[PDB]
Amino acid sequence: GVHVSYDNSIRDADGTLVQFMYGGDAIDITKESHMTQFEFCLDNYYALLKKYNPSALIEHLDVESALKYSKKTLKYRKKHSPHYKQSVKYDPVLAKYNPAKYLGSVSENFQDKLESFLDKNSKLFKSSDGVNEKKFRALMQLKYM
């Protein structure tokens, strides 16, 4: 009976809600394997850009609302980067926007690893021909969606 509701919540066929998100990220295991292999995606960037080209879809969704919450949450996160001193003013971005609709609503764990990759690889971004952490970050958010 246990399945995914259309609202991304896991409800049983009864209707009883079990989780507000699948594993808390709404990620499919059959997808995840490379969702955290950033460098690989980068060396094969243009191919993935040819697969997930966003210009077809940039008309169907919002690229800011989640990004803006990302801005306030980035503020509290840089301020609060002890556990029981939680972000009670800011739920995670996945709580406030359907992750399939506003590009950027992503687990803070995934966001953190992605940014940390972008910082530790700024030098590959100083070895590339035509790629940036804003277009690369855009690609990784779109892969996440």
């Binding site: 009976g1 066929a13 009864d14 009883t16 079990v18 989780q19 699948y22 594993g23 990620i27 295991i29």
Partner: protein, 49 residues
Amino acid sequence: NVFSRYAISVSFRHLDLIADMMTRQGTYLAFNRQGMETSTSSFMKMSYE
């Protein structure tokens, strides 16, 4: 820990969901007939044991 002992990888999404279903009542609600009693689908009860 049980799977790690056998060095098997299992996504946390699976285990964590299962646990959430075991706590659906706020307790340690096993998966046998006893825990099944409180679910609402009567045929599912009929068709187990």
